[PDB]
């Protein structure tokens, strides 16, 4: 649906190209990711949904 | 939909000409109809021994052939082994996409068995401390894969405190998992030793452990 | 080949949204025909669309759209068959299927969504070593368990990647929302417990990855 | 799970406010009082991971705060803003914290250490917000009207906040140099070391091991660690991207904002003395109560004053009426019957 | 500096309006408003639909007489008709001998199609001043669309154009105006709810899907059918549908003072009338210092051709001698010719032919080129057709 | 409104770059030589190089969704008016729209209400309404407003996109040793015409 | 038969056409009356 692509290919909103598992292990690749949906559409919810305890390395 | 009285059914030996004979539901599918009987394979995987209803498909064995059989989708996979594990479906080609059918997942004569191959670790020094105690036989090699595990603990089978995985069947025919006597820290240390008693096909083994 | 790169295991909520991605190889995303496809947890592949090369997003099937969502990231040389926002039942496999070589003539990878949400928990590996009384033969038992986790994706793996040969595995089967399983590497008498012999259980979400030894208790 | 405080860090800052005269570059810093709301709560950002675990949860008695260059857990008790004396914390998440607290013109803000080193931050923070209504009142009333008045609501998940969460800055620390016999002998210590040695020749180079620049010095030497862990809200105290772009974050921001309607008082009806022409209103207002009178015809003349003493004002009797709103109660008509 | 000219109110004609600035060189500018809106106050009390009778199923008393009930609908029409004989299809309809007595009830409804289309009858408000506008200024034909009250400032190309109040008055909108699905019809509604029989607006919606009509559409029940179930039941026809038949013509074609009344919103696009103050706050970088401007001077603007019609029809080749090179502004210093360009690049001892003309034949007219001021005095020619599409200079 | 000054472009080692971002009230400036100290001692590494290219745009205010000024365009009035009559002995009330054309049949009886002879009401040429004001001011331009006046902040509408202001941001050149913007800026209109 | 595929995008042919790694529009062929001829009116789509 939301092309979630963090510049490489547009996977889905909660399921983008590191989507889940994305935002915890590249710290700066959370931070491209929040520079790229930072100024995206889906990045705050592409954010929340990788990034915010609710990747695979979640109980979630 | 594109899903027939189709070959469901093929269990024979290595080297059978494995014969999806599916009885179309509503007919023949031609090579523009691109009846194929391709092998979707175990895993999800999507692949062609016969594809496009004429033709052998590409990255399958020689003596694949999809085309029609009966009156229906017609698989004839030569060479069929019993490591040839896959789904023979025999479906069409709309001319806006290849639709597999519901196939037949089989397995063939071949594979021989082996023993399992049990390493029985105990109720470990990290698990008895907190709730946990699981002396677990991690089976390698049970071939093939039937093989049941029974409770042996503190002098009866345990009716609660025995614990079998999913023992995952191996690509060398044998199967494997945990199985164990995994109970608690009065689970672990009131039992002798957590322990899983291996029936593999009636025959016996020990995958069990001492603490 | 024209073969998809499939997606992930798709662990999304009951509306929860997610991508079987089909990074289409044998063409670019502009060159690889990716049929959309769900590999249904009943009958096997339930179409979602058929795409041809020049174009490779698959146009969606009869019922293939909707909650299954064709997409194309054709400059990075795939799709994506979104599972998006579906309800309980839909837990199915998002593959693609290569449309040249006249059916689908290669598959993709497919990949496992499930509509079930939950919190932000730890996950479990711990080493299944030899036995205390050896646990040792012309193999041993080496490796690890993976242990009270979920959702898609989370990872256990025995031997620790030298350890490839004699893996008996079971997978992380959700008991009480835990993932249970255990997988034990047949690694060599020197490896188990002489060398490095050990299993892991492993999610990117906090980028958190576990080993647990595989090594005799004396 | 939302483990956006996961994400989150303690970020120092080199505040003024600092206690003594000397700011210091304290975990305690107020970014900004985000305080418009016509309730009189103030919500002020402050510079520490108040109301978060140190292990990431919700730390429902413990807040952290960035110490030394790590994390660093305290109890929530050793929360403290005065603004003329401590007033009532309403509540904290992250860097944000609302409180009712009372007049002044300096908002210091303490934060008790868990060696009790209470870092107070003091800005000059003028929060002193005008009371709406007929009256200045001066605490919560029993009987009065309930005017619509904003609020920072108690609702402290990030909807509508977006914190400049960019990546941390280049945080310089003097201890990753040491001395070979006076030489260049410095210890890695596990961080992103950035070591620029005062050497021949390439003295640069930002690794992450151990250095050994022989005919270095620590003044021969210089050591920064590398943060590429955390999220850190973009407070002007913070060195930013000179060494970046912009390429930072932007995250949820608690505690937003709602209105509500405070009951407020008015006070009793004066003595009224009506002769001819003239109304004597004798009211003795128990707070600064503004009372105005009108001509209740064209030519209004509608004056107001505020009231603190015993006030008998002889009211003009107009002969379209006085409009007399005194207080927060409805405005007394006065027709002069003749 | 803010130059404030006053544009004629009527789009089209490119007006010039020559800033001076003082330290400067000349800075004429061009400006013309493209369109003007007129959005009026719109108040819609009625609703224009159709009304039809919703009269039931003829309540035959085979033998027996009852008694009408007052149902409160729009016109509800009740009526016994005492002593039908009424047979049936399939017989007679009733089996007693003379007392069967039709129960006529019928109200008003507001039709499917009154549902979509409702004549609005909006009370007429004061109108909305906006107007888009382009200029050729400071090198650049950039444009600003406005607010025209006065006080919707658009600094845009570093310039604080603030246009507005427009001076003239002639609203498109009446006191009282019908929407009726493309068009607007200056028309006066009845009373809300107080029509009359036969009027345009005879269903009065009180809202737009409203709940309330005022329908007086003189239904009145006829005498029964005889012997069988039928509604004698005459009413006044569509008042709407009169006033659909009566559709009339629209300010489209019946705009006063060459306005464009267009609605959905209702507005008075186009209307050309009265003058444009504009007030332009130009910045310093239009001020251009006339010592930095070229030294253009010993200039003779002969005349070469004379034609007084709907163009600029002067050609001038101004033989001028300039110190430097540079775009001289060459704006009219006159009052009667329109030149077509604004500037000219002045490169030397060069002869800028300038495209200069105006209505008056005999035309002896100044033309500044950024310093220079110089006389051309022509003779014109006469017009050669004697229709043009739209005025000219 | 507020203002969104960044975390500080610490130029370290080498001279500042000028960069105009487009927002409203975009500041920028480059202080170079800063020789700003770190909370773990020394910000730039290096120390003739460093220099702070600070910068800080306008933000509209956050409580802009709460606390609304509205300039309304008064234009004319409606009236619409009740009254109660004891028509048959019964008093029974009846609210219509009074502008004459509304006219109520209520009980009966044909009510035509209005028009009213005046119209000298409450309602001004430009109103304003601030949440429960009610004044008759006069606004500023709308995206034309002045600086420091009741409507600094202006906005063509209270939920809109876009805000004119010229907040005085006069960012000064930064203390010794501290990362700090030191940034002159107007009082706040919504702290003027609301505290006024 | 014109492909809007890459390589083969052209051809007046004669059979099937085999661009595999073509679309659905990643083909076009067009039908053309080269037969008969048709009495010219220019509502019909004449020799352009």
Redo the contacts between chains.
């Keep these: 649906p939301v092309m979630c692509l963090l510049a490489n290919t547009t996977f889905p909103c909660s399921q983008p190209p590191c989507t889940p598992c994305c935002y915890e292990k590249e710290p700066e690749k959370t931070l491209r990711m929040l520079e790229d949906n930072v100024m995206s559409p889906g990045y705050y919810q592409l954010l929340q949904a990788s990034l915010t305890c609710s990747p695979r390395r979640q109980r979630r | 939909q594109a899903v027939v009285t189709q070959e469901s059914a093929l269990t024979t030996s290595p080297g059978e000409t494995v014969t999806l004979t599916c009885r179309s539901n509503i007919g023949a599918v031609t090579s523009s109809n691109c009846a194929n009987w391709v092998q979707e394979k175990p895993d999800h995987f999507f692949t062609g021994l016969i594809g496009d209803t004429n033709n052998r498909r590409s990255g399958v064995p020689a003596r694949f052939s999809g085309s029609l059989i009966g009156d229906k989708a017609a698989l004839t996979i030569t060479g069929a082994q019993t490591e040839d594990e896959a789904i023979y479906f025999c479906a069409l080609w709309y001319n806006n996409l290849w639709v597999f059918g519901g196939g037949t997942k089989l397995t063939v004569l071949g594979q021989p068995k082996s023993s399992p191959s049990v390493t029985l670790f105990p109720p470990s020094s990290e698990e008895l401390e907190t709730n946990k105690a699981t002396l677990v036989c991690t089976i390698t090699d049970f071939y093939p894969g039937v093989v049941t595990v029974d409770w042996k603990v503190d002098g009866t089978p345990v009716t609660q405190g025995m614990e079998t995985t999913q023992p995952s069947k191996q690509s060398n025919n044998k199967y494997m998992a945990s199985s164990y006597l995994t109970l608690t820290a009065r689970a672990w240390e009131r039992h002798s030793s957590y322990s899983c008693q291996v029936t593999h096909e009636g025959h016996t083994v020990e995958k069990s452990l001492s603490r | ?2 073969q998809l790169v ?7 909520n009951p509306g ?6 089909c ?1 289409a190889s ?2 670019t995303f502009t ?3 990716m ?1 959309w ?1 769900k ?1 249904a947890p009943g ?3 339930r ?1 979602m ?8 997003e ?2 969606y ?1 009869e019922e293939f759209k909707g909650r299954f ?1 064709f ?1 194309l ?1 054709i400059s ?3 799709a ?1 068959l ?4 579906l309800t309980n039942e839909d837990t199915a ?1 998002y ?1 693609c ?1 290569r ?12 990949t496992t969504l499930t509509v ?8 479990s590996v ?8 050896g ?9 690890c ?1 993976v242990k009270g ?6 990872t256990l793996t025995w031997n620790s990647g030298s350890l490839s040969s ?6 992380a ?1 959700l008991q009480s ?1 835990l993932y ?5 590497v ?1 690694v060599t008498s020197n490896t188990w417990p002489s060398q490095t012999i050990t299993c892991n259980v ?7 990855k576990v080993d ?1 030894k595989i090594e005799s ?1 004396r | 799970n939302f483990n956006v405080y996961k994400a989150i860090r303690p970020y120092l800052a080199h505040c003024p406010d600092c206690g003594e005269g000397h700011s210091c570059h304290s975990p305690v810093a107020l970014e900004r009082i985000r305080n418009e709301a016509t309730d009189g709560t103030l919500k002020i950002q402050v510079s520490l991971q108040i109301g978060i675990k140190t292990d990431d949860s919700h730390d429902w008695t413990k807040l952290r705060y960035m110490d030394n260059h790590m994390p660093a857990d305290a109890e929530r008790a050793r929360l403290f803003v005065r603004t003329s004396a401590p007033c009532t914390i309403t509540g904290t998440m992250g860097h944000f914290i609302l409180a009712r607290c009372p007049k002044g013109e300096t908002l210091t803000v303490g934060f008790t250490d868990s060696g009790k080193i209470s870092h107070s931050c003091t800005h000059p923070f003028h929060h002193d917000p005008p009371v709406i209504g007929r009256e200045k009142f001066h605490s919560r009333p029993q009987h009065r009207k309930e005017l619509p008045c904003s609020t920072y609501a108690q609702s402290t998940a990030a909807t509508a906040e977006e914190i400049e969460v960019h990546m941390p800055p280049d945080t310089p620390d003097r201890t990753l140099m040491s001395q070979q016999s006076g030489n260049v002998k410095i210890t890695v210590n596990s961080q992103t070391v950035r070591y620029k040695c005062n050497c021949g020749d390439s003295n640069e180079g930002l690794t992450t091991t151990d250095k050994v620049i022989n005919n270095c010095k620590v003044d021969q030497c210089h050591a920064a660690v590398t943060n590429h862990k955390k999220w850190q809200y973009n407070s002007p105290l913070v060195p930013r991207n000179a060494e970046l772009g912009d390429r930072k974050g932007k995250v949820h921001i608690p505690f937003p904002l709602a209105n509500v309607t405070c009951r407020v008082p008015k006070a009793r009806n004066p003595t009224v003395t009506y002769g001819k022409n003239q109304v004597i209103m004798l009211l003795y207002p128990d707070h600064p109560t503004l009372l105005s009178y009108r001509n209740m015809g064209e030519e209004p003349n509608y004056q107001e004053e505020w009231v603190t003493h015993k006030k008998e004002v002889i009211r003009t009797v107009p002969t379209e009426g006085l409009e007399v709103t005194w207080g927060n109660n409805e405005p007394y008509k006065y027709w002069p019957q003749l | 500096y803010e130059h404030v000219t006053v544009i004629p109110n009527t789009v089209g004609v490119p007006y010039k309006t020559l800033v001076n600035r003082p330290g400067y060189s000349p800075m004429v500018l061009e400006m013309e408003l493209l369109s003007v809106t007129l959005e009026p106050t719109l108040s819609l009390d009625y609703i224009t639909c159709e009304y039809k009778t919703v009269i039931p199923s003829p309540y035959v008393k085979c033998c027996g007489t009852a008694e009408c009930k007052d149902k409160s609908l729009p016109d509800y029409s009740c009526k016994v008709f005492t002593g039908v004989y009424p047979f049936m299809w399939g017989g007679a309809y009733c089996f007693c001998d003379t007392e069967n007595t039709q129960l006529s009830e019928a109200h008003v409804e507001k039709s499917e199609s009154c549902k979509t289309e409702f004549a609005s009858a909006y009370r007429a408000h004061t109108a909305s001043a906006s107007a888009k506008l382009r200029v050729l200024y400071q090198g650049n034909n950039v444009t600003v669309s406005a607010y025209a009250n006065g006080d919707h400032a658009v600094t845009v190309k570093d310039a604080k154009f603030i246009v507005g109040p427009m001076s003239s008055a002639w609203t498109p909108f009446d006191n009282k105006i019908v929407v009726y699905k493309g068009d607007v019809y200056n028309m006066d509604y009845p009373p809300f709810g107080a029509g009359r029989p036969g009027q345009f607006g005879d269903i009065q919606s009180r809202t737009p899907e409203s709940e309330d009509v005022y329908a007086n559409t003189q239904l009145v029940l006829q005498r029964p059918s005889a012997g069988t179930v039928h509604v004698p039941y005459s009413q006044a026809p569509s008042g709407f549908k009169y006033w659909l038949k009566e559709r009339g013509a629209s300010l489209q074609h019946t705009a006063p003072f060459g306005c464009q009344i267009a609605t959905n919103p209702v507005r008075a696009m186009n209307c050309a009338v009265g003058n444009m103050p504009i007030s332009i706050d130009i910045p310093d970088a239009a001020f251009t210092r006339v010592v930095d401007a070229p030294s253009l001077t010993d200039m003779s603007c002969e005349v070469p051709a004379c034609t007084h019609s709907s163009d600029f029809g002067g050609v001038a080749i101004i033989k001028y001698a300039a110190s430097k090179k540079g775009k001289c502004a060459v704006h009219s210093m006159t009052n009667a010719v329109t030149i077509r360009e604004a500037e000219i690049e002045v490169e030397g001892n060069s002869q800028l032919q300038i495209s200069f003309s105006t209505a008056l034949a005999s035309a002896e007219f100044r033309v500044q080129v950024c310093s220079t001021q110089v006389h051309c005095a022509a003779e014109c020619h006469p017009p050669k057709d004697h229709i043009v599409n739209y005025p000219a200079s």
């Design positions: 080949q024209i499939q997606s992930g295991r798709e662990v999304k929860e949204t997610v991508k079987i991605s990074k044998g063409y060159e690889y025909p049929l496809v590999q009958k096997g592949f179409w669309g058929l795409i041809y090369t020049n174009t490779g698959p146009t099937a969502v997409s990231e990075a040389s795939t994506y979104q599972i998006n926002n496999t593959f299927v449309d040249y070589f006249i059916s689908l003539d290669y598959w993709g990878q497919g079930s949400s939950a919190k932000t928990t730890a996950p711990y080493p299944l070593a030899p036995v205390c009384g646990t040792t033969g012309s193999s041993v038992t080496l490796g368990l986790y979920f959702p898609e994706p989370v004699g893996v008996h595995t079971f997978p089967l929302g249970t399983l255990s997988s034990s047949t492993a999610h990117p979400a906090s980028s958190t647990k208790r």
